[PDB]
Design a protein around this ligand. Sequence first.
Ligand SMILES: *[C@@H]1O[C@H](CO)[C@@H](O)[C@H](O)[C@H]1NC(C)=O
Ligand SMILES: *[C@@H]1O[C@H](CO)[C@@H](O)[C@H](O)[C@H]1NC(C)=O
Lengths: 390, 390
Amino acid sequence: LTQPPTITKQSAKDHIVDPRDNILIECEAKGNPAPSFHWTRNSRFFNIAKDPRVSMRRRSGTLVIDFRSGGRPEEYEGEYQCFARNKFGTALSNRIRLQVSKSPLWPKENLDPVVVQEGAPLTLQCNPPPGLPSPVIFWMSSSMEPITQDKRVSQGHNGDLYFSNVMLQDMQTDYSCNARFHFTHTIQQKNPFTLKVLTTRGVAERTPSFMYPQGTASSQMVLRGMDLLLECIASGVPTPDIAWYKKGGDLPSDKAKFENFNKALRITNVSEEDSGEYFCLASNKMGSIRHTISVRVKAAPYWLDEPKNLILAPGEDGRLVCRANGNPKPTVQWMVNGEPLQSAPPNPNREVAGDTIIFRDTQISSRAVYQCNTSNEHGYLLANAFVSVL
Amino acid sequence: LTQPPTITKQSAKDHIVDPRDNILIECEAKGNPAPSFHWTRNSRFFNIAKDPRVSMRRRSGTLVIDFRSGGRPEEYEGEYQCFARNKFGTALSNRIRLQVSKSPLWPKENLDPVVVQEGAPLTLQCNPPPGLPSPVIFWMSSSMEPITQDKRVSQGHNGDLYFSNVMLQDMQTDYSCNARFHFTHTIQQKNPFTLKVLTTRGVAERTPSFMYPQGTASSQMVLRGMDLLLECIASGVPTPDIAWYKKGGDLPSDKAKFENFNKALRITNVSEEDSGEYFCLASNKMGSIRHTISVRVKAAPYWLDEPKNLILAPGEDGRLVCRANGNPKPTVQWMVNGEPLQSAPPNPNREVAGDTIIFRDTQISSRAVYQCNTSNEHGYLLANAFVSVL
Ligand SMILES: *[C@@H]1O[C@H](CO)[C@@H](O)[C@H](O)[C@H]1NC(C)=O
Ligand SMILES: *[C@@H]1O[C@H](CO)[C@@H](O)[C@H](O)[C@H]1NC(C)=O
């Protein structure tokens, strides 16, 4: 009873949808003095009435936009912010980036027959088209027969297909890169590669050498929580065996798995403790080289102590503390009802100490919802906390 | 020397192109008094200058239209006719239908798990999207594993997948229809079908019954030259064996092949002699039913005697005969320089006998190119023949 708005459910920050279906932007509220809603397509006001196909909802501010007449969803891209308003304060939602899934065709590629000597390394670049999200890449023949992968032949994360050493039995099937898209079931293919393997004498043996990572070292930045992939692909004759190691300590036995044919290492859910230097060894027979990967880990803001709601009695004191850890250190910005706190209407019962807003002798005038935006180079955390007195 | 236009090479009537590449409409001429060209987008004049990206060519009227700035090829659809003009007459080209290849997404299909009893017939309709040309349909699992086909299970031309009788071992892989497009390498997929086979006692045996062709009889009209497919799919227990026959005569041993697992019969390059009644028998064990297909064959005009060029001496006689066989009988229409012969400028040396234009005492005034359009419900044959005197 008699309380400022509290958002219950809303859509994701990265709202991607296919052209096949209709638009459904969500935003559910909560509070006894019936909350009224209003969005803001981009950095300006959104008109629900002035546009026919768009419409709010009964007991909420959700959206439902179906295109029966015309209307292309490509004309609805942009950021969306929901506002649940009340006589006391205004609530905010994460600026939702509405985007449509794309399944682009490949560029005009006139591929020449690939002629390579037996035993020599070979890289066939896939170079897939953009699209949201990232497509799943796999290699099959033009006649739709799947290509078997092993220690000698496998694909990278970038989608390129690698040959440690080409055998005269590779001329059996051609090679076409396929791009499957997650949202809309669509596979896109590029022209097939034809191989011409040359027989000189037999197969000369040579020391191993890394193909995919260019050089002796590669650097990677991975955010906290996201998975971390390390790849070591090498060309040899008896085909190099990859062995993973970490400098100054063993690899997390529970948190690490060898994905490919030991060619790739995946550490899931990384933390600041996984930051370091990792390296792989390509053991052959004649020689053995090493690749050092420098992995630094940053972090999108995460709550250490999320600001909580205040339900006080007139005259009693309360605090709004908003702090989160992040790498680099996250900036704090408070907003009252969506309006910057630097330009907000004065209040003698309110005290701002940067990261903390303390209330002394709270009265029926300090009622409102406050927003805390922990701005970071890798992301943010928008918070909602209300102040209500009896 | 001193002669009316003669077209050497031109583009196909059904000119389909992908969005990936650029437009290249062709039209090459021939004649000493240098021929000048001009097209006609649809039933009106085409302006090469008024449009920037479009451009004719040096020693011809060919076209080359690349979109570097903007320009969507979807805005260039329509019929195109080339005109090679000369002081004596004007040549015509087939009205080229320029169209772009389409690879549409499937409609919103929320598929329920399919539950069927063991031994019962089952049809899973594919219902592919339009697109030009017709897509190649195949069935694979969602995990990209190919489905094996046999006498019991195979797909029709319509793309639908048929089960003569469902076995409890069908629950091994799911079923997703794939639509591969010829021009642009694109495969489109629909949601997978999940099977739930029910075991009652075992597998009851029943007489055969046709699944795909609805009823005891089906009618087909096939044009001359095009291939003719006949399909008989039947559901039985020991699985029906299809045997093909023709009423009143054997099937063309050299011109017929059994494509599927004897479920389909293909007669290539048909003629009026292949028109008749064909039927297949579905032999089982308990019973054996019959399906009669009535096949009538029509024909797009083909030359019996194509009009030839006249190279006469002033005073000598010559004829222009234009006749072609077709089903139904083709209409003849003559045009002088593209202008209807009913409204053309008079000529005392010219005689029109409907299908034949005879010239008596030809002089330096009857020089021109005449067009013969054998209009048929299934197509046409535009002809070019010139009259030149010394
Ligand atoms: C927080 O600040 C950042 C940087 O200006 C901005 O990108 C983000 O949208 C803000 N949070 C919200 C959703 O108000
Ligand atoms: C011949 O006549 C038919 C029917 O009017 C028409 O469709 C066709 O375009 C004509 N031939 C040409 C290309 O002039």
